[PDB]
Design a protein around this nucleic acid. Structure first.
Length: 92
RNA sequence: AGGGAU
C-alpha cells in the first residue's frame, strides 16, 4: 500500500513561479506523462494563479512517480508535488 | 504575491 485518501492519477502542485501553466507542469514532468486537458490552475480576482495547481497523471501509478519531483526545480525555482483527488480538481 | 513543509 502507498495511499490512504487517493487512488487516482490526481496530484497537486505548489511553489509555482506564479506564471507556470499546463506547458510548464508538463515539461516539469517530461520524464512522465499526463492525461489530455488533465491540468487545472486556480486564480485570484486578478486572474493570476494562487500559487498552486492540480493535475491528473496517467492513473495513480504515474502520480507516485511524479512524487520524485518533490522539492525539484522548474528552471529557477523549486516545486512541490502533494497528492490529490477529484474532490480538489472537479472544477472541470 | 509566497514556501508552506505539504
Amino acid at each position: 500500500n502507498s495511499a490512504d485518501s487517493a487512488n487516482d492519477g490526481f496530484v497537486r502542485l505548489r511553489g509555482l513561479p506564479f506564471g507556470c501553466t499546463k506547458e510548464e507542469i508538463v515539461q516539469f514532468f517530461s520524464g512522465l506523462e499526463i492525461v489530455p486537458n488533465g491540468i487545472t490552475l486556480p486564480v485570484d480576482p486578478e486572474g493570476k494563479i494562487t500559487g498552486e495547481a492540480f493535475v491528473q497523471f496517467a492513473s495513480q501509478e504515474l502520480a507516485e512517480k511524479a512524487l520524485g519531483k518533490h522539492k525539484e526545480r522548474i528552471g529557477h525555482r523549486y516545486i512541490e508535488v502533494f497528492k490529490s483527488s477529484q474532490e480538489e480538481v472537479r472544477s472541470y
